[PDB]
Enzyme design. Sequence first.
Site, PDB file in Angstrom:
ATOM      1  CG  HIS A 109      -1.964  -1.049   1.103  1.00 44.29           C
ATOM      2  ND1 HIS A 109      -3.051  -0.904   0.256  1.00 44.29           N
ATOM      3  CD2 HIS A 109      -2.127  -2.265   1.717  1.00 44.29           C
ATOM      4  CE1 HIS A 109      -3.814  -2.007   0.385  1.00 44.29           C
ATOM      5  NE2 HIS A 109      -3.295  -2.869   1.265  1.00 44.29           N
ATOM      6  CD  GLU A 127     -10.632  -6.273 -17.227  1.00 47.63           C
ATOM      7  OE1 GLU A 127      -9.748  -5.366 -17.261  1.00 47.63           O
ATOM      8  OE2 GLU A 127     -11.499  -6.387 -16.306  1.00 47.63           O
ATOM      9  CG  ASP A 134      -7.764  -8.591 -15.203  1.00 50.21           C
ATOM     10  OD1 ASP A 134      -7.452  -9.699 -14.760  1.00 50.21           O
ATOM     11  OD2 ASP A 134      -8.314  -7.724 -14.505  1.00 50.21           O
ATOM     12  CB  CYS A 174      -7.812   1.870 -19.201  1.00 52.24           C
ATOM     13  SG  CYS A 174      -8.809   0.443 -19.033  1.00 52.24           S
TER      14      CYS A 174
END
Lengths: 573, 573
Positions: B189, B431, B455, B502
């Site tokens: 994170h 994807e 993906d 994207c």
Amino acid sequence: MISGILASPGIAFGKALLLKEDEIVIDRKKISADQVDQEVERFLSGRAKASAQLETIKTKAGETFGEEKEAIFEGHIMLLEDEELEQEIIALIKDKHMTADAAAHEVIEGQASALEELDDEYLKERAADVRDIGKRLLRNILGLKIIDLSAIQDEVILVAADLTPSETAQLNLKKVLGFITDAGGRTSHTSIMARSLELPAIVGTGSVTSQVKNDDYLILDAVNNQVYVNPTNEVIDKMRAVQEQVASEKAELAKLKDLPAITLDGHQVEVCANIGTVRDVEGAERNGAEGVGLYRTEFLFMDRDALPTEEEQFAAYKAVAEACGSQAVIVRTMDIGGDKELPYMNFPKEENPFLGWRAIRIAMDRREILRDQLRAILRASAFGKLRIMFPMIISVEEVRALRKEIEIYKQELRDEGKAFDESIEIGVMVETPAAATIARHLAKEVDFFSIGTNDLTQYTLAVDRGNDMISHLYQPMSPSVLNLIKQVIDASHAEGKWTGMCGELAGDERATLLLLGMGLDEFSMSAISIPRIKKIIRNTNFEDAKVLAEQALAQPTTDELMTLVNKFIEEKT
Amino acid sequence: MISGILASPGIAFGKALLLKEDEIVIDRKKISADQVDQEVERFLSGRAKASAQLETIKTKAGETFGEEKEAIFEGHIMLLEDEELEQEIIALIKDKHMTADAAAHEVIEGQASALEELDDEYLKERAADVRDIGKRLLRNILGLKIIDLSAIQDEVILVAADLTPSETAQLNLKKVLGFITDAGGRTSHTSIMARSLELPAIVGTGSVTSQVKNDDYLILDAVNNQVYVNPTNEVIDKMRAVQEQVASEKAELAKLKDLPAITLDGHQVEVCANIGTVRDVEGAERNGAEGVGLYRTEFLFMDRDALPTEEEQFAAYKAVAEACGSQAVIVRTMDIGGDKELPYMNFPKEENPFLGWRAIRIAMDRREILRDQLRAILRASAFGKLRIMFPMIISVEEVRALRKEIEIYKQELRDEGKAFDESIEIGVMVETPAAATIARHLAKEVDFFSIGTNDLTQYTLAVDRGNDMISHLYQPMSPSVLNLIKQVIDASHAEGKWTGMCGELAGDERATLLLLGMGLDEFSMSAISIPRIKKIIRNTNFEDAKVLAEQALAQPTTDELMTLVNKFIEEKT
């Protein structure tokens, strides 16, 4: 109205056995004086049983294993009757006014506890055997059921909330006429055994064990998915007739050889068994397999508690090659690491095993594995027609690196005066959408393809083969997977090679006309599916199937493609 | 020679902070009458510090939050100085000859312990605040540094083995000149924050914290990937030139021009930002984005501790639509469930989240989610150009079921007197290799496509985006992924629609000529990548790129395809 998932179709009649998941509760509260005498008698009465029951187990060990295991029971029994235990168990009850289950536990636990204080692993294990004697004694006084499942003297049905792999080994297959449990589903180890054993059984009952008591008479339909408890003789009758149909079904499926899978109009395909173990060759021959289309070598690796060396592999491969006679075996190099781990490898966990460090990705990161194995396969090819095939191929890069590897291992064998079939053909699983996409490129580089639709479906649809929550999305009969299948087959044919299929689609009655029409050369499946598919093949016209296939490949929707298939089956046989 | 993964390039000079919250080790040797006096003084001397340090925290609360939080500290401080504690802490040491850290712990623990006996959740929490006062007191007597990370009064560098999301919130961004940790990698994170914050930082140091002590002076190159510990002024100066060179680039890169995405020979593409939150619109405008190509709505969902209702979503969408001015936002419906769980949903675990119950598979199994959201998007479209796009699409079935859904939600809005853009365009993420395969079919059914290569790569290659062990196999620049990209773009164009991208490939300098040559209409990326890619686009000839693309698509090997790209860059600018 109770329904489960039904893992094996069939019918059976027998008594119900219940494995009481139950546990021993010690009565720690001091007993009354009048009771002191009663508790001793309970201990003697409870001890009286274990005395005779322990003796029965001894006789089974002598006949089953021999005198080496028979005398171990005599020591346990002789130790239990030790005059020191009789005086010590009775003294605490008489002196401390304690209960027999609580007082007896202290005596056996007291000695075993002293043994644990020992600083030796060898003495500690024996303390485990002594602890076991007292552990069962508590059940014997209470009367709790001790179903070692090997102590079954009469035929019975096995009912339990769930069975652990350990029980399946020490389980009497001949005395168990079936298996019924409320486990999760097929993902349960015992559930797979019902399939391979070919015996009727349910695993999703949900709550049958709570409705059945031991010694209950139950009839398993495994056909209407219903269970009759203490039924009217008429149901015992319907079922008996249902069982007749079941038996005739076998008898019919049992035969039809002729020439291998040929359509009415003369188109031939191979139809073979996927196997795991020489032991599967039997089912393959039984079901009319024309060879082995996929020898999942992992399964051999999970048939052992250590990684099999070059030599062990060689032997295992040799046996298969030979148990297959004239027939060709497609030996796939090892595919560990999606839902098929081998625990003995202690590999680390992954967030997505099925997108992880699987199959070839391991053998390439640990050459000893790839090398031993390929070495072993090659050497085994001196003994029967074998092919080599690789799992989880994703790139032309991977294939070249592995062929190069073969060539190195080939020379070493040559140099060590070790025969191998110089003709040995090499191919690849096409079970990745990558592979499917670059099928043209890969087809120059290999002798053949086998499409793994279980995986291909999985990655093309991004649906985990294991995940029941989304199972409804797992569709190898998608316009997306079919197209990719076609594209692979065509790649094959364009190079003058061939594509087989060992994914479960090959064995799926609903794809057979499409697979055929699309020109698939080879089908490989569970042996049990060989006749259904053979039957479909033998009764199709190949030209019609092409037309079917073509249509199906243009549908943007599964339903629409199912419709074609159905109107075909209607109009065409 | 220490090297890490470098998450953000730059340079920095400052002191090093070490989070080694030292433990509380209670001295348990009883004391002597002569010592007794020494332990009391240690307590008073240690208590003397916390007295002044606690007062400093109070003043920060008053200015930072207000009088509402300032008085809470006075209660804690007033309770600590309670005359009952002074006599009770001293009495045990003097009477029981116990240590101050062990004796003091009993006094505060004794009262807090009494509060826990209470059967109320409200009284129990206050017992937590009282327990905290004694917990820090033990650290104050021992003298271990106090590191809530908000108590920083001087600029320092942050060094730790790993930081948990909780620390990142109560972290002082202005007083931390950088972040350095030995965590796992970008999957951490805190690592993502360095990227978005645009500040120099390392996360794979491996063992720098064990080599650094607090108050150490360190210079972070974040350019040569090296750290200088107490160096000569020569290194600092070199590193100051590096710091300055970084600034020059910012300056050159800050340059912006209208109609930014046109090749030398006149071919235009869109180039947009992927965003997570209105807050990202700023970076997008900053970096010359021509609109938003993907509004990952999940991110808005992880920006909250509850599922956002129709109304909250609407507001959030409205804001974005408006913070984007004239520009179009492609709002993707929610994609939870691979590596992006939202904990507040408490969904059950999956064996392969990335092949599991993800994105659309959820919204279709729980219509309230799909409905609220689509409702909200539509309604927000009354306020700025929005498009709707769906994640994880696998079949034409899925798309039709969702369009049908839109149409229902559209009417409801119509019926409730709620405007929505009747022109609103609908598209799908391509994807999945499924989607890619049936791209032709899907293209009739949607207005557009955006290819998710993160993906798509993942499923086409069956390599987990998260799995570093096989990262070397994660290649969106495979002949397999590129082909599938082409096939999708072409599908678009054949229906007279367009494909955007994207996935991170759009933003990858190495694909830009191929993506372009292959006719991709739209690129969407991290805002920070917009200028690099714009630059490449503005300096290419489009015709040349086509030729490049075509060549690349025929290569059976990545390396071979990298070669084309490189010879291009050599010969062509």
